[PDB]
Design a protein around this ligand. Structure first.
Ligand SMILES: Nc1ncnc2c1ncn2[C@@H]1O[C@H](COP(=O)(O)OP(=O)(O)OP(=O)(O)O)[C@@H](O)[C@H]1O
Ligand SMILES: Nc1ncnc2c1ncn2[C@@H]1O[C@H](COP(=O)(O)OP(=O)(O)OP(=O)(O)O)[C@@H](O)[C@H]1O
Ligand SMILES: [Mg+2]
Ligand SMILES: [Mg+2]
Lengths: 93, 146, 199, 48, 464, 50, 464
């Protein structure tokens, strides 16, 4: 039974060789097809159009809120005072 | 033989099934690291003891949370980390797969066999931290263990 | 049917290989598994392995199957946790151990129990292993581990050299569960033997 | 961008020759990317 | 109005509040945690003010699955637990939720956990001779009603068996109400105790509460306080004798040490948290019998590594008057009671209120034991042959006394098949006088071990 | 038992060339439709037909 | 890509870099000293990042004479050393530059000293027993090929003598490529070993490289890795069994502690590194025998202040299979092979692998020695008069055997001026069985000092 276990182990070695060959061919052919075929100038515009359509069709999302507490309150008060005080600001004033 | 042909057919089925999709998620930056630990800036939707990913394929766990920094520990290889990387939250508490196929095999703590052959058919994955049974759910002990 | 899970932490791979070889010669590998965290790895695996083993056990526990758990060592986990905490700039404690370490051990050892008949007849047992230096008990780690266990066995090298191969000291070893676990014939045949040996 | 986010959105464009195409946008913590290199890396990393 | 969370680490959590929103010390705070698999309701209590409306506190639950930015709400009150007559025959946690029925106990009136110590002007010592059936406690250290008696010893000495036998023997002959609280203990022990009390009809007459070790240390700070609150509610109002039993007190001292270490406070020399004696005194005073009400408190104290130089056992002794401790050497000898007579002492043993017969009984046995300890190593190494005639006869007498002190207990039935036995006081006095005057020097060594009574001794003598 | 181990080793030294015999034709026929796999991969990676 | 030095203290130096490019971890950097008398270049190693494009680094050379603003260049690679077939027969430094013939090399292959331990499926247990002329070694703890050998001991108890004796035995009986390294040695020992190897006409096939006392700690941390790298190169490519020797590994660990103190990391117990287990584990697991490659190692380890509780040997205990120990008391007794039999241990010893007679004789010898050690306390004060003859016989037997464990190795040729001897294992076991039988008890004690075989035993005994 252990010999059958090593038999499955060599089957796994064949699987490993299969994985290596498949990975090599996949990376090589994908890289060449994307650096040679789709490198046409119109392909950039086509990809941009598809990306715009994809960003259009997606569902809307929620976004908010666009450093100490006392410092923040003081900055807000100063900003309010500036806004209430700069009414008579001149071009050179 | 035909077994290798079927393996290639399954590989092509994976090829005829790959469809990457854009999704919405937040990122972060590694301020500093060393000695197997690292710090992350921003990323405000993190969770205590939540898993996060790294560019090189390694995984990290958030231990403590400062108001403007996140300290994390690197699990596996840590010599491929430098300042300026990109991190991604998984939005899920750390979990381990479980199945009956695990019998008779040796695995790393994460759950990937290192010495065995093939893979594991795991039906479910469960969270690592849970709650112990209560007193009302227990019973006395009488059977022997020779 | 009893399913057992063996956990090894921070050991030379050759030792695990030898144990696996002896067990294979035994031929029990149809119903067991091993979780390996060699010492060459990082602190995370050493810190996390017992939790993974516990979860694997719990999954069969809920199903009603009897499960047995063995921990190779426990001080290595404490050492790894101490190193992590010291790295993360946390304040130290009594000889540089973090305070909460005891709590951790509780969360690891409270899971083992026996379920009620409503949820099934499953059972779970654990045999943690602790290493000590110069048969010293004053170090607080053995004291902490002792207080959360139902019984322990002491082993000394002097008895080993005397000739007693098991080398277990009956003067100190004790079990709180008593003879209710062992068979009735054993109880009738043998009783107060530990006393007689003590006198 | 004005449809997905009610607030108006400014544009700051950066030319990236490394990418084989696509487009990437970042409005802050979130990010969206369509890139040939990223997609092929994702495809090859999951081959086994 | 509400605040936010800024820093998360371990159990300690600090939060921020707006102007005119800071609550006082020790207020319950609710935090909401949401997840697909872990949904809970974190309950926290205020610990300290850090200024600028930043307050640090601890949590009653593990902090797994938390996220920053979550609001925290305030109830403006301290911890409270329901009480009443219907609480009897039910199991509760630290927060007071009924474990047996999830919805039970949500209508009774509630009282604050924190209280105030009773006035000194209403204090009077209590003297009474309450007697049990066991020889060692009857002769060595008699108990007193309304006072404090504590147990001592290291790991695995068998004190739990002793407390179980004590409660079994006393609760039957008692008409009052008993409350049991477990600060730290294994689930198996509590479940077995619950089953045993269910096996009898006395379970309805008592109340139960306990907390396990797997919980965070925060839950191990208030279980004793909840038990004391229930006890005072019963005593002050019902005006009835009550029983308060404590498994241990070392565990909450430990959890306090760790929580103080996490709080960032400078530790002391031994590593214990500072002002631990203040907490000791605050906790111990709550158990007090006034002029009109009587309450009895049972507790056992675990010592670390059986070291008595540790300041914690020393400071916990100061609140005690009648004490009984245990040793490991006598246990290793073979004796199960394992009570050391040389160091054990009481506060009511005196010829003033008790007959001097007991007095010279105790003096004879104690001097015999002291000189036996003096000559132990000599008989071990030099040999019995060199001792004088008086010393040889005294050593034989001391061996007789040491062998006779052991006695079986019914709580050992599950461990040993021999049933236990009980003996009254006057017969024990007469038997000890007979032994210590030197008439039973002809019995064999084994004839004095594990003896029920004098007639049992005669029967076993006739058995050999 | 040594004889059984030796005969097991003989079976192993038969299988250790059996797998190579099978793998010769395996590698001969691996690239039968490799171009088709690459075309499918390109179609999926680009989102449109090649 | 130009760097600038901003802050320096001790051997540790900081550097800043342009935001565009920052070197990856484990990369060498080149510097210079502009001083005339102290003109020298420095090689720096990346340690960690501190943000703001800052990098911490450690100097490979003494850091005196450095001034701020000096340009720093990067080569974008780790430290590499030369490898080739013609390396053996030469002495090397830490950086790999040849010493006897300066400029030699620089045309062989170059490999980095940082790699990964082998996978799990490539390891295999080994049980081949290896014999030696010494009797105490193969009697108690036989050595196993392809495992690890440990020689524990204190200070100045002749570890180096044993090391050179063993290397003499192995070189004379067997050939094969060999690699020697070492840290924390004195230059006089280096000269002595070089001269002895030149005399032996075997130094041509032995690779030599070692540091010394007076070097920066970085070299004391990198020399071991470099030696292991070249050994691995010999093991992998050539497909040949390799002999390896290293000396005083403990100093290595010590070095790390020092540099940790300079980095600012939090100290640990007894002032050691916050992390030490991982580096020891990765250094130990790097030595591993493959199925087609058998590698035998032997490491000498130091013990500080004659204490065995320190973590330095405590962690090493877990990575060893065959271990022998030395003691101060046994050396003070007079016998030079001061090897404790009661403390030494091995894992190859088993009746399934070793003959039954060997196992039985070893067990009996251990039992006798243990009994004598047990009675040593009592005999220390009274003596032999009170002790019975039934134990006097075993006392005499134990004294005779423990005196017979002494031996006269060749290594003392320059101290006592007498040739050594070797003994086959069969003669050893038969002689020890005869001695345990008690036939030799009539012979005088002083005849068993420094004797080789039983024939010499008889000749010496009859000569007096
Ligand atoms: N009278 C007795 N006869 C037989 N065994 C006894 C007797 N009294 C106690 N024991 C034994 O002592 C143990 C009881 O443990 P127990 O819980 O009482 O100890 P403890 O001192 O409270 O220690 P810990 O808190 O460490 O568990 C059991 O092993 C039980 O068999
Ligand atoms: N068999 C022996 N014959 C003669 N002298 C011996 C023998 N064994 C030990 N010695 C003596 O013991 C001492 C050992 O010196 P050596 O330099 O070898 O010590 P070491 O313990 O290896 O060194 P270190 O201080 O580095 O640990 C010397 O004085 C040596 O003469
Ligand atoms: Mg007890
Ligand atoms: Mg030396």
């Amino acid at each position: 039974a252990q010999g059958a276990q090593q038999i499955q182990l060599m089957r796994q070695q064949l699987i490993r060789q299969l994985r290596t060959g498949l990975g090599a061919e996949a990376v090589n052919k994908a890289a060449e097809i994307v650096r040679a075929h789709v490198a046409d100038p119109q392909a950039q515009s086509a990809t941009v159009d598809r990306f715009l359509s994809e960003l259009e069709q997606m569902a809307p999302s929620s976004v908010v809120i666009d450093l100490r507490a006392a410092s923040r309150q003081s900055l807000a008060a100063l900003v309010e005072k500036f806004d209430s005080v700069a009414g008579g600001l001149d071009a050179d004033g | 033989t035909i077994s290798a042909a079927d393996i290639e057919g399954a590989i092509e089925d994976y090829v005829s099934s790959f469809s990457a999709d854009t999704e919405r998620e937040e990122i972060g930056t590694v301020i500093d690291a060393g000695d197997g630990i690292a710090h992350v800036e921003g990323l405000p939707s993190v969770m205590t003891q939540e898993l996060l990913e790294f560019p090189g394929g390694v995984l990290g766990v958030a231990l403590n949370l400062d108001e403007h920094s996140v300290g994390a520990v690197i699990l596996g290889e840590f010599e491929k980390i430098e300042e300026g990387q990109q991190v991604k939250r998984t939005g899920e508490v750390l979990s381990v797969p479980v199945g009956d196929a695990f019998l008779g095999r040796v695995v790393n703590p994460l759950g990937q066999p290192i010495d065995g052959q093939g893979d594991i058919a795991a039906e479910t994955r469960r969270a690592l931290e849970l709650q112990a049974p209560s007193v009302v759910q227990r019973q006395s002990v009488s059977e022997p263990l020779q | 049917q009893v399913r057992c899970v063996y956990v090894a932490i921070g050991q030379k791979g050759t030792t695990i290989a030898s144990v696996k070889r002896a067990l294979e010669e035994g031929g029990a590998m149809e119903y067991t598994t091993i979780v390996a965290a060699p010492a060459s790895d990082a602190a995370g695996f050493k810190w996390l392995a017992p939790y993974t083993g516990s979860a694997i056990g719990q999954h069969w526990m809920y199903n009603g199957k009897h499960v047995l758990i063995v921990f190779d060592d426990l001080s290595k986990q404490a050492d790894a946790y101490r190193a992590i905490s010291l790295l993360l700039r946390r304040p130290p404690g009594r000889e540089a151990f973090p305070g909460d370490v005891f709590y951790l051990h509780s969360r690891l050892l409270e899971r083992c129990a026996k379920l009620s008949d409503e949820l099934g007849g499953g059972s779970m047992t654990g045999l943690p292993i602790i290493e000590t230096k110069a048969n010293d008990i004053s170090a607080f780690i053995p004291t902490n581990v002792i207080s959360i266990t139902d019984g322990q066995c002491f082993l000394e090298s002097d008895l080993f050299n005397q000739g007693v191969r098991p080398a277990i000291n009956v003067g100190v070893s004790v079990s709180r569960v008593g003879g209710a676990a062992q068979i009735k014939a054993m109880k009738e045949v043998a009783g107060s033997l530990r006393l007689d040996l003590s006198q | 961008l004005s449809r997905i986010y009610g607030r108006p959105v400014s544009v700051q464009l950066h030319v990236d020759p490394e990418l084989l195409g696509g487009l990437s946008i970042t409005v802050g913590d979130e990010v969206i990317d369509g890139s040939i290199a990223s997609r092929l890396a994702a495809a090859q990393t999951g081959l086994p | 109005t509400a605040g936010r969370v800024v820093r998360i680490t371990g159990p300690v959590v600090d939060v921020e509040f707006p102007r005119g929103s800071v609550p006082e010390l020790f207020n319950a705070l609710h935090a909401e945690i949401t997840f697909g698999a872990l949904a809970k309701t974190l309950t926290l209590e205020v610990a300290q003010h850090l200024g600028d409306s930043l307050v640090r506190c601890i949590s009653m639950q593990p902090t797994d699955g938390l996220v920053r930015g979550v609001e925290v709400t305030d109830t403006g009150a301290s911890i409270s637990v329901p009480v009443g007559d219907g609480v009897k025959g039910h199991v509760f946690n630290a927060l007071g939720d009924c474990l047996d029925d999830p919805g039970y106990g949500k209508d009774f009136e509630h009282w604050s956990i924190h209280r105030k110590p009773p006035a000194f002007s209403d204090l009077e010592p209590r003297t009474e001779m309450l007697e049990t059936g066991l020889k060692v406690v009857d002769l060595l250290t008699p108990y007193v009603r309304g006072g404090k008696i504590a147990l001592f010893g290291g790991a695995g000495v068998g004190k739990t068996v002793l407390i179980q036998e004590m409660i079994n023997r006393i609760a039957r002959n008692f008409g009052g109400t008993s409350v049991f609280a477990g600060v730290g203990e294994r689930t198996r022990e509590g479940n077995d105790l619950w089953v045993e009390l269910a096996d009898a009809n006395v379970l309805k007459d008592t109340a139960l509460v306990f907390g396990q070790m797997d919980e965070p240390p925060g839950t191990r700070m208030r279980v004793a306080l909840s038990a004391l609150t229930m006890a005072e509610f019963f005593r002050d109002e019902q005006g009835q004798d009550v029983l308060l039993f404590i498994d241990n007190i070392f565990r909450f001292t430990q959890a306090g040490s760790e929580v103080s270490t996490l709080l960032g406070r400078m530790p002391s020399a031994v590593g214990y948290q500072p002002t631990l004696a203040d907490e000791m005194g605050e906790l111990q005073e709550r158990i007090t019998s006034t002029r009109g009400r009587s309450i009895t408190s049972m507790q056992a104290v675990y010592v670390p590594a059986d070291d008595y130089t540790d300041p914690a056992p020393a400071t916990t002794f100061a609140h005690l008057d009648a004490t009984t401790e245990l040793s490991r050497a006598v246990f290793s000898k073979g004796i199960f009671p394992a009570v050391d007579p040389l160091a054990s002492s009481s506060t009511i043993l005196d010829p003033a209120i008790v007959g001097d017969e007991h007095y010279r009984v105790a003096q004879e046995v104690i001097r015999i034991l002291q000189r036996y300890k003096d000559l132990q190593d000599i008989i071990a190494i030099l040999g019995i042959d060199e001792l004088s005639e008086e010393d040889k006869q005294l050593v034989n007498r001391a061996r007789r006394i040491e062998r006779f002190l052991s006695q079986n207990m019914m709580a050992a039935e599950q461990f040993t098949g021999q049933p236990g036995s009980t003996v009254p006081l006057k017969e024990t006095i007469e038997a000890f006088d007979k032994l210590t005057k030197g008439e039973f020097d002809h019995l064999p060594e084994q004839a004095f071990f594990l003896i029920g009574g004098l007639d049992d001794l005669a029967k076993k003598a006739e058995s050999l | 038992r040594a004889q059984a181990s030796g005969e097991v080793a003989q079976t192993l030294t038969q299988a250790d060339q059996q797998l190579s015999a099978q793998g010769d034709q395996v590698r001969s026929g691996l690239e039968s439709s490799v171009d088709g796999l690459s075309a499918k991969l390109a179609s999926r990676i680009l989102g449109v037909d090649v």
